[PDB]
């Protein structure tokens, strides 16, 4: 119903403009690898193939603008509708009252799903200035993700 957002599309269009590099108007898997190297990352060819799997309705091996727009736009639906990240925090609440214990929080983040070391979970706690005591709220994390 609501009109689509042009200001947000403009960011997507600049990303599309940067990403095409052989200059044929469309973004293929080896161009994504070319972008990755330019960001100092040399992932495996299989990883580059796999991370593209989402994008296309018809599977055309190169990423057209609306599909690229959907890849970029899809993240915006999580930003616009914050229900997914808010619910993603909610499924870990041991007591059901909105406050999560700090000790509980480290083990389920560190050892599960994507695995990250203690130094990486330190950044999440410290840079959001979370307190030493066990009660940590997760609403502030969603607001940090969406406010800026």
């Amino acid at each position: 119903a609501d009109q689509l957002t042009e200001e947000q599309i403009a960011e997507f269009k600049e990303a599309f403009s940067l990403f095409d590099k052989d200059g044929d108007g469309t973004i293929t898997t080896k161009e994504l690898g070319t972008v990755m190297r330019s960001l100092g990352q040399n992932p495996t060819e299989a990883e580059l193939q796999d991370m593209i799997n989402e994008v296309d309705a018809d599977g055309n091996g190169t990423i057209d603008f609306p599909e690229f727009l959907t890849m970029m736009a899809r993240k915006m639906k999580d930003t616009d509708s914050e229900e997914e990240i808010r619910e993603a925090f909610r499924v870990f609440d041991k007591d059901g009252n909105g406050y999560i214990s700090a000790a509980e929080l480290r083990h389920v983040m560190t050892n599960l799903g994507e695995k990250l070391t203690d130094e990486e979970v330190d950044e999440m706690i410290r840079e959001a200035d979370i307190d030493g005591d066990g009660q940590v709220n997760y609403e502030e994390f969603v607001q940090m993700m969406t406010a800026k």
């Binding site: 990403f19 990352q41 796999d50 991370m51 799997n53 989402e54 899809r74 990240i85 599960l112 994507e114």
Partner: protein
Amino acid sequence: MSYYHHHHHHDYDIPTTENLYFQGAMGILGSGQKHFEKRRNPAAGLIQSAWRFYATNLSRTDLHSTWQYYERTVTVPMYRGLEDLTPGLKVSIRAVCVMRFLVSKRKFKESLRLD
């Protein structure tokens, strides 16, 4: 050491194996909890990937001093005369990060399914 850490005392040491195996007992901790366990796997992956995604853009003017120096030093980039701001760099890194976020959403939905 008269006191015992675990009341059951089934074995001296516990062995953990990565492979699932063909046959295993489900176990009981309250079976309804296991519905949350399947859901938690995409939630855990999305939270980790989102934090990794946000950290790349965390700061420009004062913080991310080291990142700023590493970006300035590289030879390939041209003198940035035309545009003072560098959002395009921030957009470019956070654009590649979400491909992992989205595919982790599909893969961890597959992990939710147990097929």
